[PDB]
Design a protein around this ligand. Structure first.
Ligand code: FAD
Ligand code: FE
Lengths: 381, 53
C-alpha cells in the first residue's frame, strides 16, 4: 500500500525510478515535481542553439508517457513544501503523502546576485527546460545578451548563444574562467576560444545595476562600464537545495548529508544527484549521479549497496575550445606543469612519485583522455 | 557502419572506429557491445543512445 516517493523528475529521479523498476515492479511509485515533468537531459540545454532546437525539441517524453513506462503516478507542477520525518510524510500545501521510503532528488538552485535599477528583476536563470523556454521566449528577435557567471555552465551557454547568433558579454568578478575547476593556463585557452567567437569578457567587475534604456537595457558594471543589452542570463553558479531538509531536521553541510548508501541522517529518507553530498562529495554532474541511482535502486529493493566513485573526468561542452578536466581528488597534492602550446594544451598534475593524479586538456590534447584515465586515482579511495 | 549518439551528453560511438581502449574493436556493431556498457562521458546505459547515421 505504501509507495516509494521520489521528489524530482530530473536525471536523478527518473534514473533511480528506472533502475529500481528493474528490481521491484509491484510496490506503488509516486513521483512529484515542481516543473512540467517532461523527460529531457539538462546537459543538452547548453547545446540547443547549435543543434537548432527549441525547448520542445529537447523534450524526449511527456510525464504521462513516463508514468506508463515506470508504472508510476507522476504529479507535475506540484511543490513539496515540507518533510515530516517523524510521521513518514511530506507536505504539499495542506495535503499530505505517506511514504514507505522518501527519495530527495530535488537538485540545486541558481546562485542569486544583488542587482539595482528598475530592471533589476529581468535576469533569466537557465536551470531547467522551463527556464530555457522562458529565456528563448525573451530572446526572440534580440541581438545582445549579458551573461553573469564564468564557470562551466556560463562558458557553455556563452559558446552556444554565440553560435545561435547572439553577441555575448560575460561579466564575473573571478579572475579566470572556471576558477577552482581549472588551471589558469587551460582557462586562458578556453577564454581565448570563446573570444574567437566574439564573446567579450569582463573579469573582475560585478553587475551594479540594470536599467531600462530606449529599445532595451543598459547594464552598468561596478567599474563604470555601461553595456547595452536586450536581456541578462544569470549563470553565476549552483548550490544544492537544502532549506527543506534542514528545516525537517536532516543533516546538511554543502548539500544533504548522505553516506555511501545514500541515506540521510534519518531512517527512510535518502538523497541523490545535485542535492546530495555523498560521503563529503557534492558533485554536480551526471556520472556520480548514475552510480548513485544504480546503488540506491539496489538498496531500495532490499539489497544494501554502496557507491564507490572511480575517476570521473569532466567533459566541458565548449566546441570553440574543447576541454576535458579531472581535478585531483580531495586530500591529494601535486605540482602542475604545462605541456603543449597555444590552444592544444596539456596540463598535468603529478604527485611526488611522478604519477598523474589530475589533468586539463584543451584543443587537440583532449584525444589523450583515455590513456590518462587509466593512471587516475578514484574520487573515493 | 553506424553512428550512435548519447541522448544525455552527446557522446558519439562510431561503429567504424569502435573504442579500442574500452576496449571495443573497429567495426563492432552496437548490438554486439556488452549490455553492461556505459557512456564514457556521462555514464548512462545503452538505452540512452540513438542511431543517428
Ligand atoms: C547548462 C548545463 C549543462 C550541463 N552539462 C553537463 C554535462 O555535459 N555533463 C554532466 O555530467 N553534467 C552536466 N550538467 C549537470 C547535470 O545536468 C546535473 O548534474 C543533473 O542534471 C542534475 O540532475 P538532478 O535530477 O539531480 O537535478 P535536477 O535536474 O535539477 O532535478 C531536480 C528536480 O526536482 C524538482 N524539485 C525541486 N524542488 C522541488 C519541490 N520543492 N517540490 C517538488 N519538486 C521539486 C524539480 O522540478 C526537478 O524535477 C549540466 C548542467 C547545466 C545546467
Ligand atoms: Fe553520455
Amino acid at each position: 500500500r505504501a509507495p516509494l516517493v521520489i521528489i524530482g523528475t530530473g536525471l536523478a529521479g527518473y534514473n533511480l525510478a528506472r533502475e529500481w523498476r528493474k528490481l521491484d515492479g509491484e510496490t506503488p511509485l509516486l513521483m512529484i515535481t515542481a516543473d512540467d515533468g517532461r523527460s529531457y537531459s539538462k546537459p543538452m540545454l547548453s547545446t540547443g542553439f547549435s543543434k537548432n532546437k527549441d525547448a520542445d525539441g529537447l523534450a524526449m517524453a511527456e510525464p504521462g508517457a513516463m508514468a506508463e513506462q515506470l508504472n508510476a503516478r507522476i504529479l507535475t507542477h506540484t511543490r513539496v513544501t515540507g518533510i515530516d520525518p517523524g510521521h513518514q510524510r511530506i507536505w504539499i500545501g495542506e495535503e499530505e503523502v505517506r511514504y514507505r521510503d522518501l527519495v530527495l532528488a530535488w537538485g540545486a538552485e541558481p546562485i542569486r546576485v544583488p542587482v539595482e535599477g528598475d530592471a533589476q528583476d529581468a535576469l533569466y536563470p537557465i536551470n531547467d527546460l522551463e527556464d530555457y523556454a522562458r529565456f528563448r521566449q525573451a530572446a526572440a528577435g534580440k541581438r545582445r545578451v549579458l551573461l553573469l557567471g564564468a564557470g562551466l555552465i556560463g562558458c557553455e551557454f556563452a559558446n552556444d548563444l554565440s553560435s545561435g547568433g547572439y553577441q555575448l558579454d560575460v561579466v564575473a568578478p573571478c579572475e579566470q574562467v572556471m576558477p577552482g575547476l581549472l588551471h589558469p593556463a587551460a582557462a586562458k585557452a578556453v577564454q581565448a576560444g570563446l573570444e574567437g567567437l566574439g564573446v567579450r569578457f569582463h573579469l573582475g567587475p560585478v553587475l551594479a545595476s540594470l536599467k531600462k534604456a530606449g529599445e532595451g537595457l543598459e547594464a552598468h558594471l561596478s567599474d563604470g562600464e555601461v553595456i547595452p543589452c536586450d536581456l541578462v542570463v544569470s549563470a553565476v553558479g549552483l548550490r544544492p537545495r537544502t532549506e527543506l531538509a534542514f528545516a525537517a531536521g536532516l543533516a546538511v553541510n554543502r548539500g544533504i548529508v548522505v553516506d555511501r548508501s545514500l541515506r540521510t541522517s534519518h531512517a527512510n529518507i535518502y538523497a541523490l544527484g545535485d542535492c546530495a553530498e555523498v560521503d563529503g562529495l557534492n558533485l554536480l554532474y551526471v556520472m556520480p549521479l548514475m552510480a548513485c541511482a544504480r546503488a540506491l535502486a539496489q538498496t531500495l529493493a532490499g539489497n544494501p549497496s554502496q557507491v564507490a566513485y572511480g575517476p570521473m573526468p569532466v567533459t566541458v561542452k565548449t566546441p570553440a575550445c574543447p576541454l576535458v578536466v579531472s581535478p585531483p581528488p580531495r586530500g591529494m597534492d601535486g605540482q602542475w606543469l604545462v605541456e603543449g602550446s597555444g590552444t592544444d594544451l596539456k596540463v598535468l598534475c603529478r604527485d611526488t612519485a611522478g604519477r598523474v593524479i589530475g589533468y586539463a586538456l584543451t584543443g587537440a590534447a583532449v584525444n589523450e583522455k583515455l590513456a590518462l584515465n587509466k593512471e587516475l586515482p578514484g574520487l573515493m579511495a | 557502419m553506424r553512428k550512435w549518439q548519447c541522448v544525455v551528453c552527446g557522446f558519439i560511438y562510431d561503429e567504424a572506429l569502435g573504442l579500442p581502449e574500452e576496449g571495443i574493436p573497429a567495426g563492432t556493431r552496437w548490438e554486439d557491445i556488452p549490455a553492461d556498457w556505459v557512456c564514457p562521458d556521462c555514464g548512462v546505459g545503452k538505452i540512452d543512445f540513438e542511431m543517428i547515421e
